[PDB]
């Protein structure tokens with residue numbers, strides 16, 4: 001991960017020991033202009049001209065931030081998952097296309113060909129380990 | 135963790151993917167003739183259960199349903 | 215004309231000097247370096263307290279801690295406890311103070327016998343404290359707390375009861 | 381009813397025999413979590429807990445049954461007499477320690493090895509703690525017994 | 535006016551028998 | 566016979582809670 005941290009003096013709302021112990025996420029993006037943007041947790045910061053990087057405690061802070069950057073007309077936002085052993089993964093746009101738009105490589109996951117109304121009654125499914133929504 | 139189940143009555147609004155904060159959802163194509171768009175729940179580990187997807191679903195009743203279950207650090211939204 | 219209006223927005227101006235800083239050099243961390251948190255006076259005091267002092271054994275840390283607390287906890291039971299207006303008032307303080315020390319030692323052993331999670335690092339003390347990150351270190355700390363705790367309370371008992379002769 | 385007694389482990393060749401007194405859940409918990417066998421303790425802390433138990437123990441027989449029983453200095457004799465045993469008990473440990481001990485041993489009630497008692501340093505640190513805790517336990521029992529009328533007097 | 539002492543001591547000794555079986559009953563259920 | 570209450574009451578108020586909470590706390594934290 002390569003990028004400049006946005007300039008802000010610091011804030012109590014931010015990374016805690018859970019970042020070092022369990023996992024921390026990091027959001028990266030590129031800007032045309034240096035502007036002011038509200039951080040995900042308190043305060044304001046001055047994003048640099050290009051290749052900005054920010055470490056966030058949760059994934060929700062990044063996508064929430066990504067929506068704000070879209071209002072500044074920035075859609076090249078990328079999120080990573082950093083584990084304590086240094087492992088990094090391309091999490092949010094696993095495929096390069098955004099989730100809203102379609103791609104052929106994707107496949108159905110947890111699809112029910114029936115309707116919710118046609119779910120089995122739970123009395124038919126008890127003492128078996130099965131749930132109705134399967 | 136939680137389980138997001140998506141049923142046959144999807145029509146391809148894509149609104150569920152937008153309202154989601156955690157990117158648990160993704161729009162995939164259908165081999166069928168219905169449309170080139172179906173909602174999916176590929177990464178359910180990040181599902182927190184905020185039911186924003188169920189607020190953006192314009193069906194007679196929910197095509198996409200969120201069933202709560204076992205909890206984790208991620209599903210509880212704990213930054214500590 | 216401008217007594218101070220011209221002076222603002224200058225680095226030489228005394229107002230513009232900043233006392234608060236990001237934790238370490240990474241602002242993304244939680245804490246903030248402040249005079250209370252990161253001053254040399256507070257850093258020296260906290261880092262050289264028995265829990266954080268360099269090059270001490272876990273037993274010697276608890277003895278310093280227990281001797282303090284044992285000598286402290288005698289006071290509330292004696293003057294403000296029951297039978298405070300009786301001849302044996304100071305005696306009740308010695309027993310009650312040692313009672314908390316036992317419960318305090320019991321709590322240490324329980325937190326010890328439960329595999330403790332970690333000992334954390336902060337701005338006031340950058341290094342980790344000591345070998346309190348293990349089941350063995352906390353146990354030795356508990357045995358030391360009980361010895362100092364009973365000793366400190368006896369010391370407070372002897373001085374206060376024998377204060378008139380002193 | 382089921383069979384209670386069984387061979388030690390899977391080997392019947394070995395001497396040990398699993399029995400209720402030997403290999404019950406209650407006894408295995410108590411013995412294995414005693415200070416000599418408790419997990420996650422240092423050799424020093426094991427001896428202190430042991431000596432503190434024995435020091436507080438040995439005060440009684442001297443005072444209540446020794447000479448000067450029916451005297452004013454009866455309880456004092458129990459404290460001094462008890463400390464004499466802890467010193468001799470500490471000496472016995474140091475001699476058994478300074479002489480190369482053979483080893484500790486495992487049994488059914490304590491399957492894993494006991495602790496780092498397989499060296500001179502393990503027993504010597506045990507001995508130093510025995511004298512400290514042993515003198516402490518006897519001193520405690522002296523003040524309680526001598527001032528028991530006061531504590532009840534409260 | 536009150537039960538004798540030896541009677542009261544007996545009732546406590548008898549009380550161990552329900553307590554013992556109660557402990558054995560409970561540990562059986564947890565399995 | 567009234568000396569039983571002097572021994573039993575503090576046992577119920579202090580000893581039994583300490584033994585139960587100490588056992589339960591360590592038990593719920595095992596792995």
Ligand code: CLA
Pocket residue numbers: 550553554556557560561563564
């Ligand atoms: C009528 C009351 C009653 C009964 C019969 C049971 C029965 C049971 N409970 Mg239960 N429970 C109850 C009330 C009751 N519960 C209440 C009010 C709560 C609070 C919400 C719970 C909370 C609870 C939990 C959280 C769990 C159970 C579980 C269980 C099962 C295992 C045995 C057990 O309780 O652990 C025995 C507990 C012990 C601490 C062991 C010691 C035995 C008793 C308590 C003490 C007796 C010793 C005595 C005082 C000393 C004198 C004798 C001495 C001389 C030897 C069993 C089906 C467990 C389970 O999963 O079920 C399958 C479990 O995890 N219970």
Ligand code: CLA
Pocket residue numbers: 295296297306309310312313316534574575577578579
């Ligand atoms: C249900 C059981 C129970 C029992 C038997 C007691 C008994 C007692 N409590 Mg108590 N308490 C209880 C529950 C109980 N508490 C609970 C649940 C609470 C929470 C609300 C409290 C809150 C409470 C307060 C806030 C205070 C007491 C105090 C006292 C003592 C006052 C006696 C007196 O008249 O003046 C004093 C008469 C004396 C003869 C002097 C007593 C000296 C102490 C008790 C000697 C203790 C030595 C001890 C065993 C050492 C422990 C180490 C050992 C474990 C190895 C008495 C021993 C008072 C006290 O100060 O006690 C010192 C007091 O201030 N209790």
Ligand code: CLA
Pocket residue numbers: 285286288289290292293294370373374
């Ligand atoms: C309600 C809590 C309380 C009570 C009742 C006491 C009571 C007592 N403390 Mg004490 N103390 C306390 C809290 C308390 N302290 C705290 C919080 C600390 C740590 C900051 C200390 C540290 C301390 C030390 C280091 C010493 C005492 C001593 C004494 C005894 C003085 C002798 C006497 O009887 O004169 C008559 C007493 C009174 C009429 C009332 C109390 C007056 C004392 C002097 C108050 C001192 C504490 C101070 C004001 C706390 C503020 C700290 C805060 C700014 C951080 C007395 C029994 C001394 C001792 O053992 O006696 C030989 C001693 O050497 N205390």
Ligand code: CLA
Pocket residue numbers: 437439440441442443444445521524525
């Ligand atoms: C002959 C050996 C002997 C003698 C003389 C004593 C004497 C004493 N013990 Mg003691 N004790 C013994 C063996 C002995 N014990 C054994 C073998 C153990 C371990 C099982 C203990 C564990 C023990 C504890 C845990 C405590 C004492 C305490 C006391 C004192 C009670 C106060 C008093 O004087 O009341 C008057 C006493 C008497 C008139 C006669 C002695 C009566 C005691 C209560 C008998 C207890 C021992 C028992 C009968 C031995 C068989 C145990 C076996 C089933 C394992 C007293 C000095 C208490 C103490 O320090 O006092 C404050 C205390 O807290 N003892």
Ligand SMILES: CC1=C(/C=C/C(C)=C/C=C/C(C)=C/C=C/C=C(C)/C=C/C=C(C)/C=C/C2=C(C)CCCC2(C)C)C(C)(C)CCC1
Pocket residue numbers: 281282283285286361362364365366368369
């Ligand atoms: C000013 C200031 C302050 C204050 C301080 C204080 C107030 C102090 C404390 C105090 C204390 C808290 C003290 C204590 C002390 C104690 C002691 C002095 C102890 C003693 C001990 C002893 C001596 C013991 C011994 C023994 C043993 C151990 C065992 C056996 C027995 C015997 C007894 C021998 C502070 C820091 C806050 C802040 C800053 C400033």
Ligand SMILES: CC1=C(/C=C/C(C)=C/C=C/C(C)=C/C=C/C=C(C)/C=C/C=C(C)/C=C/C2=C(C)CCCC2(C)C)C(C)(C)CCC1
Pocket residue numbers: 360361364365432433434436437512513514515516517519520
């Ligand atoms: C029922 C039962 C039983 C019984 C039991 C018994 C009877 C017990 C014993 C008892 C004992 C045997 C006890 C002892 C204890 C002791 C103590 C209580 C101690 C004390 C200590 C101290 C406190 C000290 C401290 C110190 C020090 C260390 C140093 C300085 C000084 C001082 C003092 C501070 C048995 C197990 C057999 C079996 C099973 C069942």
Ligand SMILES: CC1=C(/C=C/C(C)=C\C=C/C(C)=C\C=C/C=C(C)/C=C/C=C(C)/C=C/C2=C(C)CCCC2(C)C)C(C)(C)CCC1
Pocket residue numbers: 546547549550552553554556557559560569572
């Ligand atoms: C201390 C002492 C004494 C006494 C002792 C005795 C003899 C006692 C007995 C008594 C006892 C110690 C008792 C206990 C109790 C018992 C019981 C009887 C319990 C149990 C019950 C039950 C019935 C339970 C229930 C349950 C179940 C079943 C299940 C679940 C859980 C529950 C808990 C709910 C004497 C004076 C000698 C001497 C001095 C010291």
Ligand SMILES: CC1=C(/C=C/C(C)=C\C=C\C(C)=C\C=C\C=C(C)\C=C\C=C(C)\C=C\C2=C(C)CCCC2(C)C)C(C)(C)CCC1
Pocket residue numbers: 310313314317
């Ligand atoms: C310095 C410091 C701090 C702070 C602190 C404070 C500011 C406070 C504390 C507080 C506390 C922590 C308190 C405590 C208290 C307690 C009490 C209040 C108790 C009492 C008790 C009693 C009353 C009892 C008695 C008894 C016994 C023991 C036994 C026998 C019986 C009787 C009941 C007698 C911290 C943590 C941040 C950190 C470290 C350092």
Ligand SMILES: CC1=C(/C=C/C(C)=C\C=C\C(C)=C\C=C\C=C(C)\C=C\C=C(C)\C=C\C2=C(C)CCCC2(C)C)C(C)(C)CCC1
Pocket residue numbers: 461464465468
């Ligand atoms: C528990 C147990 C057991 C058992 C045991 C028994 C059952 C018994 C023993 C026994 C014994 C082991 C005994 C001892 C005794 C001793 C004596 C009897 C001594 C005495 C001495 C004296 C009397 C002296 C004194 C003195 C001194 C010390 C110094 C100075 C001088 C004089 C002379 C003063 C066993 C081992 C298996 C294991 C572990 C646990």
Ligand code: SF4
Pocket residue numbers: 140143144145146147148149150151173190191192193197198
């Ligand atoms: S009906 Fe619901 S799940 Fe289907 S496309 Fe519309 S918002 Fe998405």
Ligand code: SF4
Pocket residue numbers: 138153154155156157158159180181182183184185186187188200
């Ligand atoms: S409940 Fe929340 S995380 Fe789950 S699908 Fe709906 S919006 Fe997404």
